Design a protein around this motif. Structure first.
Motif, short mmCIF file in Angstrom:
data_model
loop_
_atom_site.label_atom_id
_atom_site.label_comp_id
_atom_site.label_asym_id
_atom_site.label_seq_id
_atom_site.Cartn_x
_atom_site.Cartn_y
_atom_site.Cartn_z
N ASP A 205 0.82 -1.20 0.00
CA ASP A 205 0.00 0.00 0.00
C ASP A 205 0.85 1.26 0.00
O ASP A 205 0.51 2.21 -0.70
N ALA A 206 1.95 1.26 0.76
CA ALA A 206 2.90 2.37 0.75
C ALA A 206 3.55 2.58 -0.61
O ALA A 206 3.64 3.72 -1.08
N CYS A 207 3.99 1.49 -1.25
CA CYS A 207 4.53 1.56 -2.60
C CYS A 207 3.52 2.12 -3.58
O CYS A 207 3.86 2.98 -4.40
N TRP A 208 2.29 1.61 -3.56
CA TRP A 208 1.29 2.06 -4.52
C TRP A 208 0.86 3.49 -4.27
O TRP A 208 0.68 4.25 -5.23
N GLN A 209 0.74 3.89 -3.01
CA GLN A 209 0.40 5.24 -2.63
C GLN A 209 1.49 6.24 -2.95
O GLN A 209 1.19 7.41 -3.14
N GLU A 210 2.75 5.81 -3.01
CA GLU A 210 3.80 6.72 -3.44
C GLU A 210 4.09 6.67 -4.93
O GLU A 210 4.61 7.65 -5.46
N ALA A 211 3.75 5.58 -5.63
CA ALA A 211 3.96 5.49 -7.06
C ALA A 211 2.78 6.06 -7.84
O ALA A 211 2.92 6.34 -9.03
N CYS A 212 1.64 6.22 -7.19
CA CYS A 212 0.51 6.93 -7.76
C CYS A 212 0.68 8.44 -7.73
O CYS A 212 0.23 9.10 -8.67
N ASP A 214 3.67 10.02 -7.89
CA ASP A 214 4.72 10.31 -8.86
C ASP A 214 4.21 10.29 -10.29
O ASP A 214 4.77 10.97 -11.15
N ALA A 215 3.16 9.53 -10.57
CA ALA A 215 2.55 9.54 -11.89
C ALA A 215 1.78 10.83 -12.15
O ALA A 215 1.65 11.23 -13.31
N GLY A 216 1.26 11.48 -11.12
CA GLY A 216 0.59 12.76 -11.23
C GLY A 216 -0.86 12.74 -11.66
O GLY A 216 -1.66 13.57 -11.20
N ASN A 217 -1.23 11.82 -12.55
CA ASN A 217 -2.59 11.70 -13.05
C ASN A 217 -3.44 10.75 -12.22
O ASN A 217 -4.43 10.21 -12.73
N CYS A 218 -3.09 10.55 -10.96
CA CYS A 218 -3.69 9.52 -10.12
C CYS A 218 -3.94 10.07 -8.73
O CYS A 218 -3.09 10.76 -8.16
N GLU A 241 -0.97 -0.89 -15.28
CA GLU A 241 0.02 -1.96 -15.39
C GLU A 241 1.20 -1.55 -16.26
O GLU A 241 1.69 -2.31 -17.09
N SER A 242 1.66 -0.34 -16.06
CA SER A 242 3.01 0.12 -16.34
C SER A 242 3.56 0.91 -15.17
O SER A 242 4.72 0.70 -14.79
N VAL A 243 2.74 1.77 -14.55
CA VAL A 243 3.13 2.51 -13.36
C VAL A 243 3.35 1.61 -12.17
O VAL A 243 4.43 1.66 -11.56
N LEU A 244 2.39 0.75 -11.83
CA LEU A 244 2.52 -0.15 -10.70
C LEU A 244 3.46 -1.31 -10.97
O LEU A 244 3.79 -2.05 -10.05
N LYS A 245 3.89 -1.48 -12.21
CA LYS A 245 4.81 -2.56 -12.56
C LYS A 245 6.25 -2.11 -12.64
O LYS A 245 7.14 -2.83 -12.21
N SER A 246 6.51 -0.91 -13.17
CA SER A 246 7.87 -0.38 -13.18
C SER A 246 8.31 0.12 -11.82
O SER A 246 9.51 0.32 -11.61
N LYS A 247 7.38 0.33 -10.89
CA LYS A 247 7.71 0.92 -9.60
C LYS A 247 7.43 0.02 -8.41
O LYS A 247 8.05 0.23 -7.36
N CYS A 248 6.54 -0.96 -8.52
CA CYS A 248 6.06 -1.70 -7.36
C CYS A 248 6.02 -3.19 -7.62
O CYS A 248 5.25 -3.93 -7.01
N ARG A 249 6.86 -3.68 -8.53
CA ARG A 249 6.97 -5.10 -8.77
C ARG A 249 7.82 -5.72 -7.67
O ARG A 249 8.71 -5.06 -7.12
N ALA A 250 7.53 -6.96 -7.34
CA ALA A 250 8.26 -7.69 -6.33
C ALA A 250 8.83 -8.95 -6.95
O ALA A 250 8.11 -9.85 -7.38
#
Lengths: 523, 523
Positions: A205-212, A214-218, A241-250
């Protein structure tokens, strides 16, 4: 009002299926930690709803069953110190102050456990058609269950840590000392794997909340399920599935990932956080719990995030405690199990040390070893007369009449004697043991015990000299008897007339001289 | 001059907030190891300055508080052997030789701990505008703290290792035996993680100092912060982040890196050596300490550098010691906790062994098991008469008058008797136990104890034969009393007239025959 008395049998099953409720209640609180899921279809963070109703139902159906316990210690008596009582205490069924007797110390710890705090977090989430509340349900479940652990584990502490010190229904084997500290591992693994799952979802949730951001449109409202029919979600849907994948993949092979998940990358790379099978998710988290509690965190590669580091420190410390408890209760069981054998080995090392120090001849050293091995084979370290002397007098007399009455009632001067005084004779018969070729008596020596043979065969010569045999049931030592009942002797131990050699290993029951004068002075 | 006496209450709080200072002093010495940092902006090696003043301040504010202890044992007395004393020793408040009494053995170990050796290393570095002392501050902190560990841990050894052997303020639970050997882990992890941090910076300093010489256009003075306005630094500035990156990068995936950092590559690849948050750095190093002390170095992949190998060997050995100490003090606690239960289980295995060896009937085997379970339920292994006989005579008499006075003062020949002699009668009342359907006496048998019933119900028939009940408070055995106070009997135990069956489980207080003759011979 019928205020109950504390040793009623109704308050023995309402404290039998009650401590089972206190045991099963600390297994249900980790199931609230598996509520957040990830919907991998929509790439949104959600809540498992038919695990939410399941854990809320199964915790409420234990706590209002528990609510019939402070409504029953409500009707309760206690025991108070007094010298009037004759019976170690007064019972107070007066309802005016037993209320304070309950509600002065052991009410607040028991009241802060039936509180439906993790059931009202679930409540205003599942009664809506809005996705905005996935945040609050996940927010208000870690610390509430973490702080309600203390009253819920303190209401099981007097019923476990003092029911292991003085147990009530167990004596004989290893089914409550190993199978308790191994299910203490399985409970702690159940709690720790659920914390690992929940904290893994909080880091995602922290990763997604910070990668959203940085995208600006979210907006961060878009990352939760139920927020799809909001404005601006369509421009976020084609870039999920480019924003959450380039930034929050495990992945477990990346050594410089875009976000460090640390000890939680095994949870998100395996995909159990988005698992539809709850058996897979629960088993995978429980095994992580057991594997990192058993091995004290060793294989944890944390990130530089302080809450995760502190969670790892807790695992290492909790595993150290759990391991020390398990091996300390196993050593305590095993040491108490082989206590007589270790006593025999200490006594056997002492005899070798003493016989080497004194430099005994080897024929005298073999006779010592032979008797010690025979005594260990027969008695197994058990002091029989100490066991018998710690019994009630009626039970002593019945056991001794079972063991020794037929032996005494084969002596012709004892069989026609009595029942009163021969039941006082067969309370001083103590067991003797003789190895093979042991001379029980030789001629010229004072006869100082009469022997009633239990087992083994014997021999008797007097002055190739008209030998006499002795076997199971006969006795030996009638020179002591006629001497002791005659008052024309004084304290004069008579000489022996026979040489009595143990032909086999012999058991007997011995009646010594000073224990025969006491039964001869009853005339 | 007022030389103090050693059991003053002022020298009880000045040794209460004193051993706390000796405990908190070995937690502050690792904080000098977090002084070297890496400034990742400038790629220079620096010193944390507001951790330098913090650790210097917090160690000085403990050591001049400590300086009011050898200024107070200066005013001190002691105890010397003599037979003149009447009171186990002389007190010497003469100041001429108590100075040597302090300063002959336990002054040098206590003087080599208040020395501001890690405070003067910090001193001439922070009072300059020159960067050419970062070398000396990092040089003179490993070995000085490492050798001052010995006097600072030897002035806590008599106050811990002998205050755990004979503790002063603790008896009852596990809050000083588990919560001491678990905070001994947290101290050792605090020391070991700080060594790991400091040695990680020394290996990075070694890499940078050798990769700067290979570049040729660099002096090793350029690698330290505060040396930017030196000649030739501008030609080194445009080649820093290629030289120090191709030669001194730390990744955890490289199996052939240009420099081997070994166990210190986790410190430089995570970036805690250049961390601005001290909570992140401290927590990450403390968890490395706990994880490698708990798991005894297992997951250490050292380089072929001998000081690092020797530091790993020390971790493995220290973790072995710390683990053996923790599980040995947990087994010692748990074994002493369940000592009566394990004694009951040994006694219970002995009785089964003896009843199987003797081949008792099963009705006699059930009566033995029943009495042993009842005695364990009532007494819990506690020998009550041994507890009472180890009390002072006044406390014995008051406890026995509380337990047994109302019972003796319901006998009609004892209630009107005395107070002097009935307080000697209720010092021989010992507790008896009877399981259900136990015949306490049967007719024709000699009455040999009078029984004053505490608990449980009884029965009495004599010669369907005018039955008589007995319950809590009544007594039984008045045939022994009138026999014993009459001198026209001799030693002649009278026959019983009643058959007395325990209807329930009975507690009583027993007064035997030979303990009744002693109170009957007081006339």
């Amino acid at each position: 009002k019928k205020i109950f008395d504390p040793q009623d049998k109704f308050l023995l099953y309402c404290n039998k299926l009650f401590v089972a409720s206190c045991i099963l209640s600390v297994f249900v609180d980790p199931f609230f930690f598996y509520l957040p899921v990830i919907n991998a279809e929509s790439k949104c963070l959600g809540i498992d709803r038919k695990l939410a109703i399941t854990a809320s139902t199964l915790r409420t159906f234990i706590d209002v069953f528990y609510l019939a316990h402070m409504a029953l210690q409500l009707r309760t008596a206690y025991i108070a110190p007094s010298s009037r009582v004759f019976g170690r205490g007064e019972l107070v069924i007066d309802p005016a102050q037993i209320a304070k007797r309950y509600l002065q110390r052991w009410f607040i710890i028991d009241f802060l456990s039936v509180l439906p705090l993790p059931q009202i977090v679930v409540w205003r989430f599942l009664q809506s058609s809005n996705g905005s509340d996935v945040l609050a349900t996940k927010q208000a479940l870690l610390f509430i269950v973490l702080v309600q652990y203390i009253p819920r584990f303190l209401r099981v502490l007097p019923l476990t840590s003092e029911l292991k010190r003085t147990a009530g229904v167990f004596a004989e084997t290893a089914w409550a000392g190993a199978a308790y500290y191994l299910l203490l591992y399985m409970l702690a693994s159940h709690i720790v794997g659920a914390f690992w799952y929940l904290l893994a979802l909080e880091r995602n949730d922290a990763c997604w909340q910070e990668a959203c951001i940085d995208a600006g449109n979210c907006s961060t409202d878009f990352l939760y399920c139920g927020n799809q029919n909001m404005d601006g979600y369509a421009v976020w849907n084609r870039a999920k599935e480019s924003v959450l994948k380039s930034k929050c993949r495990a992945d477990l092979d990346d050594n410089n990932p875009p976000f460090d998940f640390g000890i939680y990358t095994q949870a998100l790379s395996s995909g159990i956080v988005s698992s539809q099978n709850f058996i897979v998710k629960y088993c995978y988290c429980l095994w992580w719990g057991l594997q990192n509690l058993s091995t004290l965190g060793q294989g944890l590669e944390t990130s530089t995030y302080p809450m995760e580091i502190i969670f790892s420190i807790s695992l290492a410390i909790s595993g150290l405690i759990l391991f020390a408890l398990l091996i300390g209760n196993m050593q305590t069981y095993l040491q108490s199990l082989t206590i007589r054998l270790e006593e025999m080995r200490v006594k056997r090392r002492d005899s070798e040390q003493w016989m080497h120090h004194r430099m005994l001849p080897q024929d005298l050293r073999e006779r010592v070893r032979r008797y010690d091995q025979y005594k260990w084979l027969e008695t197994r370290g058990v002091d029989e007369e100490y066991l018998v002397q710690n019994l009630p007098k009626d039970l002593r007399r019945d056991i001794k009449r079972h063991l020794c009455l037929a032996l005494v009632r084969r002596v012709p001067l004892f069989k026609s004697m009595d029942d009163k005084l021969l039941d006082a004779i067969c309370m001083r018969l103590k067991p003797c043991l003789f190895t093979e070729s042991t001379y029980l008596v030789r001629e010229g020596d004072p006869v100082d015990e009469m022997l009633f043979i239990i087992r083994g065969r014997l021999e008797s010569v007097t002055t190739f000299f008209n030998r006499s045999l002795l076997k199971e049931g006969e006795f030996c030592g009638e020179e002591l008897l006629t001497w002791a009942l005659d008052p024309k002797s004084g304290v004069n131990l008579p000489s022996s007339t026979r040489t009595v050699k143990a032909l086999t290993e012999v058991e007997a029951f011995a009646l010594t001289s000073e224990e025969l004068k006491f039964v001869a002075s009853q005339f």
